[PDB]
């Protein structure tokens, strides 16, 4: 749709100058479309990382809320939660870390 | 021999030799100045043989030589070198307009011959008052000149089918004017076979859009189809008579097939929106009326000397309709009645041919009867597994028929909402619902069931199983229709067992995503593997969308649930156990089960990562829903141990497919 | 408002007055067959720096080019001509005592009847000059060089099929509105149901195609003006007739099936004002197109503005006292 | 013919001038470059500058364009106004090339050719079935002979007993009235025929008076 719309304007530009600029207008349409393919990859990656973290959080919280207390003892259950908390924290205390994950991460740190 | 080149190899280039350097300025990637290699002795003898069999050609070798040149003109360079030979064979006869001895295998001899036949045939025209004893008119073309003209038209048509330069530098010629001479000969009383090779020569010329735009106005001006029917005129004129009075007299149809092929090129170079203006309302529909109401709706009526040609006619008309619906996108002005002044009266324009096609597919039309009773007739021949005359043309005529209905479903919602905003006083029905209309032959709703029967041929016609699975995926989106598909797919248990087989047969097929990337492979094999893979993806999407539709749904049938009980009481079992059929659940498991013994983990997680992502999603839906989960979460442990045998291979790892692997892992953790 | 006054010493009725682009010079033209140029001193006075005969008829308008084309004037006449003039520095030929340093570079002669109005185009179109005349035609002339202003090419004749009284170019510098010219008519015939016509340069034909016709302007028209475009998605057009009128002209977005035709407008009357109690003889806009001025047989210039609700109202009356 | 295919038109014209050759292929080939352009894609629009800049158009002026395609039509207009000595043939050529390619004629080309022959234009409109533009061409031409803008049809002097005698293409007008009447089942073919007939007596009563006014000035 974006390609059809940008090409429609590059047909609506009725002039001598626009006929001469038409190659460069298609070339700049090519960089805009490549950036938008990048934006679509970014949104699908930020979905997939977040969907995986939500699925992992769902698994951890069933191990904690629904499994019997006589299948993980009072010390190993504590070590598993102490270690998971420290690993779940460092991946969000690093400054490259995606902000879309923070509502899942703090949501896990609360249950932990 | 050289007449086909299925691997593009231009091997006829040993029979050519460059007399002029090609100056193609558009490759900018090498610096090795290879100075003037001399052409090899093989090529220097062969390109000499092609020339020296032209030396003083006797009338017996003439047609063999034109056919030898037709085979050797196959390919883009082969055509340009043959065009250059036929040019050099003429460029010698200057001033000496009495010494009749130029080459009879040259462009100028051929176009002058066509102009002379046009000049003579258009002069014997019967002035009415001459009612007395004529002798036999010794001016009709004899078969030796007809079959020579056919050989030269077929040579011309091969050359211009390939070389862009050879369409332009013949149509540009101010003394050969080939479009005007050929359309002029098509108005004359010449045999329909010579008219067919003339129309094919126009169909090969009409590839260049500059030629096509002038050809559209030249066709409209020459009335070879009569678009302007005069109120005093009792007889039509043009191909609408020749089809119904000559071809429907011979039981062979070369003229109408060549006309459909001419329109089939001239749609892909597009048609002028003002086509016919001032002579009639502008637009395409007079050509669509001929192809629909005089060709297509009349292809099952006619008798045929070639039992194959009944299908050779169906291919070339459904191709034109497919192109006209492929490239048309609906717009709000299609739903506004544009008026045009014509000889002082205000008259509405002809709507787009794709709007005309949408309107004729979104109603209980004779065109939809003929489409759906072509899909029935197609399966009804194919389910014999036999060879039959014209089989490949029936398989294509089914392919274009499926692709038309699929293009309707892909554009239907937009067409139906632009009709709601414009408030135009038409009625149209969803194709999802017209496909459930009572087939007048079988007296069942079996049109969708006959679409789904192409899946039982998925190994033998993957291009029919692909469009079938994709059409069925689109129709599965309608939660209203799901409950009825379960009825029509289970009312006949013998058909239901073929439907279950066809959905499983496409999924358990072993072809991997690897073969679409390996550059060594054939185009046709790469294509067929990609078509089989899309067929799996559309079956998994059909299952995914169907599982979130309320029970009973089509996925609960295809996965093996007991839809004659409450779903949660289903006793799922392994294939063959108590006579359990193999189902899409045993296929979705097999796709993920391959490699679960291996240190490398599951095969589809590596070799089909998008197939694996969708397979884990179906298993998640079958475990998250209340009434599948009881049967499923039993079965996955009692027969496959599946959650242990898969979780041992976490995390999954490839740097290309991160998004898909995070989603595979997302569903397995869920 | 505060008024300063100048004795104009024209030997008959003045028909028009026009500022230069900077408001530092003004031109005035008369029935005495003259044009005068007056320059504003750096002391805040004004002085008549040139005063010459331009034509053989009464002069009906005078107009300036944009200064990227120099110091160029155009004037139209009852003798059926228009003339183009350039101020030359240093060419005052003493051998011909009492000629002007404003040299006539050309005379346009193609009009069969009195040339009623003359307007240079918006500069982004090039050095173009429109005229109109009582043969019912608008003519568009064009210089192939900005220095050789003797050469002017007639590029378009536009047939209104009614007498022409006034013309207005659309001042849109935006490449999303095609070049437009509006044309008024003095025609007193009751047979011609509309006295304003609008021509778009429908690029897809090389021609000023008629886009619109103001079917509510049934009464004769003396002057016409498009409002300078403050980014608006719609044009505004003022008209001088039996009353003042203000129209909006909003382009209808073409759906992608309507090739080769001109644009079409959603047109409204936003205002109609009788308050002159008499005919309206000029309409001109301030530099931003937010305030209209208009004159009539009441001996008042009246000022008109939109309030914050687009209710156009009269805001001021400039009137003579006779003291 | 090679220079015309390249688009080197003013050097083809310079060669026609050194060898007496007819300019007809130059005008037909430039019209065919305009036709290729008016149905032309984005490549053909860029290809055009590489021959437009060859034809010396360096004194450019803006705001004159056919959309994109444009300066091919101005070069063609300028050549039809520069080379006036044979101007029937070069208008007839360009119009026959446009009509054989279904292109609606530029109104500048029409109102240039009306000043050269409105009958060779009316012959072309009958050769190409343009019966409405033929009816209104006759409707203007008859009124131009009655002085209502005579100069748009080249006419020095409109119908008067003080002028040369006038002429009209009645052969083409009889054929236009037949070409309308051949479709007599249409009510507006009858109305277009009446629009000619009623106007031709409104003209011929004035030819009768002008004849009587003239005979009374060659018998005194």
PDB file of C-alpha atoms in Angstrom, chain B residues 331-334, chain C residues 255-258:
ATOM      1  CA  UNK B 331     -12.204   2.012  -6.459  1.00  0.00           C
ATOM      2  CA  UNK B 332     -15.186   4.156  -5.300  1.00  0.00           C
ATOM      3  CA  UNK B 333     -15.697   5.594  -8.859  1.00  0.00           C
ATOM      4  CA  UNK B 334     -16.440   2.008 -10.113  1.00  0.00           C
TER       5      UNK B 334
ATOM      6  CA  UNK C 255     -10.516   9.207  -6.793  1.00  0.00           C
ATOM      7  CA  UNK C 256      -7.818   7.246  -8.739  1.00  0.00           C
ATOM      8  CA  UNK C 257     -10.183   6.527 -11.739  1.00  0.00           C
ATOM      9  CA  UNK C 258     -10.818  10.190 -12.834  1.00  0.00           C
TER      10      UNK C 258
END
